[PDB]
Write an enzyme that holds these catalytic residues in place. Structure first.
Site, PDB file in Angstrom:
ATOM      1  CB  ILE A  15      -0.969   0.018   1.193  1.00 24.89           C
ATOM      2  CG1 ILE A  15      -2.028  -1.075   1.029  1.00 24.89           C
ATOM      3  CG2 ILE A  15      -1.636   1.371   1.323  1.00 24.89           C
ATOM      4  CD1 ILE A  15      -2.763  -1.025  -0.294  1.00 24.89           C
ATOM      5  N   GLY A  18       6.738   4.244   5.007  1.00 28.45           N
ATOM      6  CA  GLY A  18       6.982   5.302   5.967  1.00 28.45           C
ATOM      7  C   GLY A  18       8.297   4.999   6.648  1.00 28.45           C
ATOM      8  CB  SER A  19      10.336   6.829   9.146  1.00 33.34           C
ATOM      9  OG  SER A  19      11.473   6.543   9.943  1.00 33.34           O
ATOM     10  CE  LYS A  35       3.049   1.362  10.532  1.00 33.31           C
ATOM     11  NZ  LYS A  35       3.122   2.343  11.656  1.00 33.31           N
ATOM     12  CG  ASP A 125       3.531  12.095  13.276  1.00 33.64           C
ATOM     13  OD1 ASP A 125       4.328  11.454  12.558  1.00 33.64           O
ATOM     14  OD2 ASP A 125       2.916  13.099  12.864  1.00 33.64           O
TER      15      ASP A 125
HETATM   16  C1  LIG Z   1      -3.645   0.647  15.753  1.00 31.46           C
HETATM   17  C2  LIG Z   1      -2.350   1.366  16.096  1.00 31.46           C
HETATM   18  C3  LIG Z   1      -1.170   0.659  15.444  1.00 31.46           C
HETATM   19  S1  LIG Z   1       0.108   1.745  14.816  1.00 31.46           S
HETATM   20  O1  LIG Z   1       1.281   0.920  14.617  1.00 31.46           O
HETATM   21  O2  LIG Z   1       0.135   2.854  15.747  1.00 31.46           O
HETATM   22  N1  LIG Z   1      -0.548   2.278  13.323  1.00 31.46           N
HETATM   23  C4  LIG Z   1      -0.663   1.351  12.235  1.00 31.46           C
HETATM   24  C5  LIG Z   1      -0.248   0.025  12.354  1.00 31.46           C
HETATM   25  C6  LIG Z   1      -0.377  -0.845  11.273  1.00 31.46           C
HETATM   26  C7  LIG Z   1      -0.921  -0.367  10.089  1.00 31.46           C
HETATM   27  F1  LIG Z   1      -1.039  -1.211   9.063  1.00 31.46           F
HETATM   28  C8  LIG Z   1      -1.343   0.953   9.962  1.00 31.46           C
HETATM   29  C9  LIG Z   1      -1.916   1.432   8.693  1.00 31.46           C
HETATM   30  O3  LIG Z   1      -1.249   2.232   8.041  1.00 31.46           O
HETATM   31  C10 LIG Z   1      -3.215   0.927   8.262  1.00 31.46           C
HETATM   32  C11 LIG Z   1      -3.998   0.030   8.957  1.00 31.46           C
HETATM   33  N2  LIG Z   1      -5.148  -0.213   8.259  1.00 31.46           N
HETATM   34  C12 LIG Z   1      -5.135   0.514   7.106  1.00 31.46           C
HETATM   35  N3  LIG Z   1      -6.125   0.497   6.197  1.00 31.46           N
HETATM   36  C13 LIG Z   1      -5.870   1.307   5.146  1.00 31.46           C
HETATM   37  C14 LIG Z   1      -4.736   2.099   4.952  1.00 31.46           C
HETATM   38  C15 LIG Z   1      -4.587   2.929   3.748  1.00 31.46           C
HETATM   39  C16 LIG Z   1      -5.013   2.451   2.493  1.00 31.46           C
HETATM   40  C17 LIG Z   1      -4.875   3.228   1.341  1.00 31.46           C
HETATM   41  C18 LIG Z   1      -4.301   4.495   1.434  1.00 31.46           C
HETATM   42 CL1  LIG Z   1      -4.129   5.454   0.014  1.00 31.46          CL
HETATM   43  C19 LIG Z   1      -3.866   4.990   2.662  1.00 31.46           C
HETATM   44  C20 LIG Z   1      -4.007   4.207   3.811  1.00 31.46           C
HETATM   45  C21 LIG Z   1      -3.748   2.061   5.947  1.00 31.46           C
HETATM   46  C22 LIG Z   1      -3.948   1.241   7.070  1.00 31.46           C
HETATM   47  C23 LIG Z   1      -1.204   1.807  11.038  1.00 31.46           C
HETATM   48  F2  LIG Z   1      -1.599   3.078  10.937  1.00 31.46           F
END
Ligand SMILES: CCCS(=O)(=O)Nc1ccc(F)c(C(=O)c2c[nH]c3ncc(-c4ccc(Cl)cc4)cc23)c1F
Length: 247
Positions: A15, A18-19, A35, A125
Site C-alpha cells: 500500500i 513510511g520511516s 505493517k 504525530d
Molecule cells: C492501531 C495502532 C497501530 S500503529 O502501529 O500505531 N498504526 C498502524 C499500524 C499498522 C498499520 F497497518 C497501519 C496502517 O497504516 C493501516 C492500517 N489499516 C489501514 N487500512 C488502510 C490504509 C490505507 C489504504 C490506502 C491508502 Cl491510500 C492509505 C491508507 C492504511 C492502514 C497503522 F496506521
C-alpha cells in the site's frame, strides 16, 4: 497473547511506506492491514523493544482508534490491524464534505484523542494522514504505535506532551475548516521550522470559510496557542465540540 503464528497471514498488495515500515493489505479471518517493520533480523534486545510498543497498542479499545488485531515475529516483525476502506483524511482534504460532516470528523478525532490521553498515551504525530476514514464515515486514528506542519513550537525547538498533541489537533481543525494546509503560501521547510519555532508564524485563520461554526475557530485558536499551558485539555475540547455539535 496476541502473536499471530508464522504463515497465518497472506500478505498482498503493497500500500505505502513510511520511516517505520511498509504497509500491505492482508488476509486473516478476513481483511487485515500488515505493517512490516523495517527490520530484517531482530535481536533479542530488539524483540523486547517490539513487545513494549505492542503492549502500548494492547490497551487501545475504541471505535475511533484504529483496531490493533495482532503482531508478528516471524517471518519479520509486523503490526496487524483492521483494514480501513476508503482513504486517509489527508487524501480527502487535499488529494481528491458538508460542514456538518467536517464537524463529525473533527468530533470523532477528539473522542479518539481524549481516549488515548485518558490512557495516558501521547500520539506524538497526529496529522490528517494518520487519520483514516473507514467506510468514509468513521475516523480511525493510527500510527501512534518528516511532517512539521502539525508540530507545536516547543516541539520544533518534556517536549512531547498531551498539549503538543492538542496543537496537532488544532492544525487538523485548520485542515478541516480551511480545506488546506498551513503555510501553503510559504513553501519552505526551514523557513516554517525557523519561524514557527520562534513564534513569528502561525496558521492563517482568514482561510476558514464563513460557514464555519465560530465556536470552532475559538476552540481551534485555543489549541493553536503558541504557549503550551494556554491550551485546553481534550476533555474540554471534546465537551466543547460535543456541545457546539447538538445543533
Ligand atoms: C492501531 C495502532 C497501530 S500503529 O502501529 O500505531 N498504526 C498502524 C499500524 C499498522 C498499520 F497497518 C497501519 C496502517 O497504516 C493501516 C492500517 N489499516 C489501514 N487500512 C488502510 C490504509 C490505507 C489504504 C490506502 C491508502 Cl491510500 C492509505 C491508507 C492504511 C492502514 C497503522 F496506521
Amino acid at each position: 497473547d496476541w502473536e499471530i503464528p508464522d504463515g497465518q497471514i497472506t500478505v498482498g498488495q503493497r500500500i505505502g511506506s513510511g520511516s517505520f515500515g511498509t504497509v500491505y493489505k492482508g488476509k486473516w479471518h478476513g481483511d487485515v492491514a500488515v505493517k512490516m517493520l523495517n527490520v530484517t533480523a531482530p535481536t533479542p534486545q530488539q524483540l523486547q523493544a517490539f513487545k513494549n510498543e505492542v503492549g502500548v497498542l494492547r490497551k487501545t479499545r475504541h471505535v475511533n482508534i484504529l483496531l490493533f488485531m495482532g503482531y508478528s515475529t516471524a517471518p519479520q516483525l509486523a503490526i496487524v490491524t483492521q483494514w480501513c476502506e476508503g482513504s486517509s483524511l489527508y487524501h480527502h482534504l487535499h488529494a481528491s464534505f458538508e460542514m456538518k460532516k467536517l464537524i463529525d470528523i473533527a468530533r470523532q478525532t477528539a473522542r479518539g484523542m481524549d481516549y488515548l490521553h485518558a490512557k495516558s498515551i501521547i500520539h506524538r504525530d497526529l496529522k490528517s494522514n494518520n487519520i483514516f476514514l473507514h467506510e468514509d464515515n468513521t475516523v480511525k486514528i493510527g500510527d501512534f504505535g518528516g511532517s512539521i506542519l502539525w508540530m507545536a513550537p516547543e516541539v520544533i525547538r518534556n517536549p512531547y506532551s498531551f498539549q503538543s498533541d492538542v496543537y496537532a489537533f488544532g492544525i487538523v481543525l485548520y485542515e478541516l475548516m480551511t480545506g488546506q494546509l498551513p503555510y501553503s503560501n510559504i513553501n519552505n521547510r526551514d523557513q516554517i521550522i525557523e519561524m514557527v519555532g520562534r513564534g513569528s508564524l502561525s496558521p492563517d485563520l482568514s482561510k476558514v470559510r464563513s460557514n464555519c461554526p465560530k465556536r470552532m475557530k475559538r476552540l481551534m485558536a485555543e489549541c493553536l496557542k503558541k504557549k503550551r499551558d494556554e491550551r485546553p485539555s481534550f476533555p474540554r475540547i471534546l465537551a466543547e465540540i460535543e456541545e457546539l455539535a447538538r445543533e
